[PDB]
Design a protein around this ligand. Structure first.
Ligand SMILES: Cc1cc2nc3c(=O)[nH]c(=O)nc-3n(C[C@H](O)[C@H](O)[C@H](O)COP(=O)(O)O)c2cc1C
Ligand code: SF4
Ligand code: SF4
Ligand code: SF4
Ligand code: FES
Ligand code: FES
Ligand SMILES: [K+]
Lengths: 214, 263, 432, 44
């Protein structure tokens, strides 16, 4: 969790059952073939991420299994697991809400988004609802700054958010439906709101402007 | 004829290619300050205590890792070098604990001594300090990890010399921690050597704890008889009693290591 | 002849013609807009011709440092020893305020893939690894779909585009770390370690990913290269002031009416860029407080500087800042400028890899001081103290993240020192 | 047929947990054989 030392518990110890399913073992094979022979350790990050997609989070047994598959020392897998922030070393809720609070999103009122989520779910930053459906955390810039304020829920970005929009999104999740990702304001992606200021003409076709000699 | 000419404060020295700036200064008897660098470990370049000015180069280089180039003039005592050392020493001491009276390293501490020779004489750090949990790695090496300066010497020793990959860093940034992550004992026949290489009191001898200060010991250079290698050792005594055993460098025998039984 | 006013880029001269994703992003749509056109001829022209075109265009790195691309890529133009050679495409995109590379990956993936091939050919690389930040999952999947289409059309893989050159494009996802955008930290992450930057030398072109010769290039730098080859370096070099050539993707965020991504000519005035494309500053130009012109790592500039500054590498260096990634963050007069910068320091504190002393300890130190400056719980002598601390970090670290955390502090102290002292005065009076 | 008014990047609304790794598994057949360092790992 917040700590970077591991203490065994009944729910997280070397004997906690974990193993890759037969389908994930085929995915691991293709992952490992993307790298030169003699450098299997390159597959630690994607294989560790796969273990988290199958299981939701990474028990210490999952880290040991990854180290065994790739034949790297287990400590070199613990270092990766604790270095990178997308690995969950404690269980998380079904929907991991990640709100960006870095300056560009703060300037467009990411706090009101954060305050709205806490009210609707009745939790605080870093908590899981007693249903174990939602976990709320703050994150650094998610790479969608022009669509601020925005959140990521699992793999999906939800952008151009107001307090009403995020509440609608959470209700859809609570009702067992995944809402559509992308801006909720009116625009589709990153174009300026209120009409295109560029790229309004039909794009040119092949060979336009090609230099002589080709 | 492969040697190249470089200068240390204007004095010419001929060095073979691949020699680092730090090694070039050694040849003229100048010891660059260091924490992470150890000549028997892989270069790390992370402590930044070895930063030095190259004449006409606007940026200081890490003397321990930078290969020296023909014609370079290394200024080991310029204001630019001295200000780099003072800055780095200041960062090292910001979160370091006020432990010298209770810390066994006191009196033979490279942090203490290099702070005296190369650091400022006062603090301008007005915040609270980091505090770290202690890790249990067996009955030989005590850990007080709040004193760790993250030089990674122990990690590189365990991996490269001892062939054990149990030590690493977990976390990131200011909360980066040296340890084993899980509860694990670093039991190797060469484990005790990480006490010597650790520049600070983070790793200390548990059997030796609290029994003596370095200045009061007498050094008797002697030989190990625990096996047939014949490791060279220093026997520390005080007022007629043996206090500890330390390695004594012998390039052709034990280098600067000893086994745990010897130690 | 030598145009002196820049901007007003026409649509025909825009490279990323699907920037807003209103046309098909898959192979058929990309080929209709001119992607993958005469790629075989470009590859057969040889590495020297491609590198010559890139050198002539005056292209500079779009990743934040702005090194001349043509010279940089030419480090790989050397005979092969035993080792393979690799092109690594930096799609980490972590700099706060920067979201341009996201648009390229999901809307013009085939420009990136074709750029990998052309750029890889110029360097003699056998494969391209595209490192994309782990959060960009849907963007990565779009890119993976486009790569599959390229393999099935014979454009990449064995005998790419029928040129006889073998090339692979791999996608590797990060796992949440801003430092993995740093070129050597990116390589370490691909090799399965913590993303901790390497010291240099060696340089990646000598010892890179898997210990092999490598070039790390930004997504935007790679994606423009096929067009620079098709339309010539001269055409690209005709935009912007000399040594600041080409078109550029700009993100405008913060307190503007229409935050947006847009492609505009290099050396365009900053004020014109905000007004024409972003719909002006919220509350009008007179409501502007400061701008961060190139992402979080560039020093902020105050309104007075923003009136006349041009958006290119040299112009912003004159303003004691930098172009960076060209991510313009606008702050109006209602902004708490101290809190805004204090939040960036907190970002760098959370992103420091912790490897080297001045950043591991120094950035955390600056974060604590800035937190007290926000509340005013400090004394004016600590301002010059903070300045000196930032100078002890800058230039003493392994990688440029330490520099990037020191520069915002220096910009705040340089341009808003009275605001700091005013707040210290308020706190003392209120508490006394 | 020049419609510059709809968003044509809707495919990712249907992506799932294993979309990325399924594409990588699909791509596996198109790759060139990897180079070799000459040993199973740096610890061999
Ligand atoms: C902390 C840090 C983060 C960086 N992040 C990125 C990034 O996300 N994308 C990028 O292209 N370059 C990034 N860079 C710059 C790269 O190290 C490198 O200069 C760049 O990828 C070179 O490509 P270019 O010459 O085409 O710009 C970063 C640098 C630092 C120090
Ligand atoms: S390690 Fe050195 S400086 Fe730190 S408390 Fe011990 S003796 Fe003092
Ligand atoms: S415990 Fe000692 S040797 Fe290991 S990293 Fe810390 S200071 Fe260095
Ligand atoms: S400057 Fe910071 S991020 Fe860069 S290597 Fe040093 S500690 Fe790591
Ligand atoms: S600052 Fe929030 S997405 Fe960039
Ligand atoms: S001794 Fe050179 S950086 Fe530590
Ligand atoms: K020690």
């Amino acid at each position: 969790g917040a700590l970077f030392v591991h203490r065994d518990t009944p729910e997280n110890n070397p004997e906690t059952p974990f193993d890759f399913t037969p389908e994930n073992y085929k995915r691991i094979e293709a992952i490992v073939k993307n790298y030169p022979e003699g450098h299997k350790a390159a597959a630690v990050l994607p294989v560790l991420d796969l273990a988290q997609r199958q299981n939701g989070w990474l028990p210490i047994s999952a880290m040991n299994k990854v180290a065994e598959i790739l034949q790297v020392p287990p400590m070199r897998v613990y270092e990766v697991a604790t270095f990178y922030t997308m690995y969950n070393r404690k269980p998380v809720g079904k929907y991991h809400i990640q709100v960006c609070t870095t300056t560009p999103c703060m300037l467009r009122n990411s706090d009101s988004i954060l305050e709205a989520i806490q009210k609707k779910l009745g939790i605080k930053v870093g908590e899981t609802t007693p249903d174990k459906l939602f976990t709320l955390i703050e994150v650094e810039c998610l790479g969608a700054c022009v669509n601020a304020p925005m959140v990521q829920i699992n793999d999906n970005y939800y952008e151009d958010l107001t307090p009403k929009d995020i509440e609608e999104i959470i209700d859809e999740l609570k009702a067992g439906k995944i809402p559509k990702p992308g801006p909720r304001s009116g625009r589709f992606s990153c174009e300026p709101a209120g009409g295109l200021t560029s790229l309004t003409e039909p794009p040119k076709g092949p060979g336009f402007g090609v230099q002589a000699g080709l | 004829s492969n040697l190249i000419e470089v200068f240390v404060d204007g004095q010419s020295v001929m060095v073979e290619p691949g020699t680092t700036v730090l090694q070039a200064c050694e040849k003229v008897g100048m010891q660059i300050p260091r924490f992470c660098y150890h000549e028997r470990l892989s270069v790390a370049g992370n402590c930044r205590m070895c930063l030095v000015e190259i004449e006409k180069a606007p940026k200081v280089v890490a003397a321990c890792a930078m290969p020296v180039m023909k014609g370079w003039n290394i200024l080991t005592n310029s204001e630019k070098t001295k200000k780099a050392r003072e800055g780095v020493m200041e960062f090292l001491l910001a979160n370091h604990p006020l432990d010298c009276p209770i810390c066994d390293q006191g009196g033979e501490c490279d942090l203490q001594d290099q702070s005296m020779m190369f650091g400022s004489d006062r603090s301008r750090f007005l915040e609270g300090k980091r505090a770290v949990e202690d890790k249990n790695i067996g009955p030989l090496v005590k850990t007080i990890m709040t004193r760790c300066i993250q030089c990674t010497r122990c990690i590189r020793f365990a991996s490269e010399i001892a062939g054990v990959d149990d030590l690493g860093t977990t976390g990131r940034g200011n909360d980066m921690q040296v340890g084993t992550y899980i509860e694990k004992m670093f039991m190797s026949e060469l484990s005790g050597n990480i006490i010597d290489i650790c520049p600070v009191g983070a790793l200390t001898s548990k059997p030796y704890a609290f029994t003596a200060r370095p200045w009061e010991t007498r050094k008797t250079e002697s030989i190990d008889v625990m096996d047939a290698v014949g490791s060279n050792i220093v026997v520390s005594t005080r007022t007629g009693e043996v206090m500890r055993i330390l390695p004594r460098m012998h390039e052709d025998i034990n280098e600067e290591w000893i086994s745990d039984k010897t130690r | 002849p030598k145009k002196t006013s820049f901007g007003s880029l026409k649509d025909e001269d825009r490279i990323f013609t699907n920037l807003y994703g209103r046309h098909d992003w898959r192979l058929k749509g990309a080929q209709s807009r001119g992607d993958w056109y005469k790629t075989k001829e470009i590859l057969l022209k040889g590495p020297d011709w491609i590198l010559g075109e890139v050198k002539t265009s005056g292209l500079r790195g779009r990743g934040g440092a702005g090194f001349p691309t043509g010279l940089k890529w030419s480090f790989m133009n050397k005979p092969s020893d035993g080792r393979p050679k690799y092109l690594v495409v930096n799609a980490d995109e972590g700099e706060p305020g920067t979201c341009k590379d996201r648009e390229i990956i999901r809307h013009d993936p085939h420009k990136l893939v074709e750029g990998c091939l052309v750029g890889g050919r110029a360097m003699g690389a056998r494969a391209a690894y595209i490192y994309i930040r782990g959060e960009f999952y849907n963007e990565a999947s779009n890119l993976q779909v486009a790569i599959r289409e390229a393999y099935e059309a014979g454009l990449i893989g064995k005998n790419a585009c029928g040129s006889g050159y073998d090339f692979d494009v791999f996608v590797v996802r990060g796992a949440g770390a801003y430092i993995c955008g740093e070129e050597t930290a990116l390589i370490e992450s691909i090799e399965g370690k913590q993303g901790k930057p390497r010291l240099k030398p060696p340089f990646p072109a000598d010892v890179g990913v898997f210990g092999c010769p490598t070039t790390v290039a930004n997504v935007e730098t790679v994606a423009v290269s096929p067009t620079i080859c098709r339309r010539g370096g001269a055409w690209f070099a005709s935009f912007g002031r000399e040594r600041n050539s080409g078109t550029k993707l700009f993100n405008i965020s913060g307190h503007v009416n229409n935050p947006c991504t847009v492609e505009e000519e290099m050396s365009v005035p900053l004020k014109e860029l905000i007004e024409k494309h972003a719909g002006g500053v919220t509350g009008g130009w007179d409501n502007l407080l400061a701008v961060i012109p190139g992402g979080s790592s560039t020093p902020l500039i105050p309104k007075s500087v923003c009136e006349t500054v041009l958006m290119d590498f040299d112009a912003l260096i004159q303003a004691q800042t930098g172009l960076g990634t060209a991510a313009v963050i606008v702050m109006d007069r209602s902004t708490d400028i101290v809190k805004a910068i204090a939040r960036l320091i907190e970002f760098y504190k959370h992103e420091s890899c912790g490897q080297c002393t001045p950043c591991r300890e120094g950035v955390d130190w600056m974060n604590k001081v800035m937190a007290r400056f926000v509340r005013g719980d400090a004394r004016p002598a600590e301002i010059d103290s903070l300045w000196e601390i930032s100078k002890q970090i800058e230039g003493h670290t392994i990688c440029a993240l330490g520099d990037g955390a020191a520069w915002p502090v220096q910009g705040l102290i340089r341009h808003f020192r009275p605001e700091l002292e005013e707040r210290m005065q308020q706190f003392a009076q209120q508490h006394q | 047929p020049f419609d510059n008014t709809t968003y044509k990047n809707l495919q990712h609304h249907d992506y799932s947990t294993y979309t990325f790794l399924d594409l990588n598994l699909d791509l596996s057949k198109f790759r060139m054989p990897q180079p070799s360092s000459g040993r199973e790992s740096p610890r061999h």
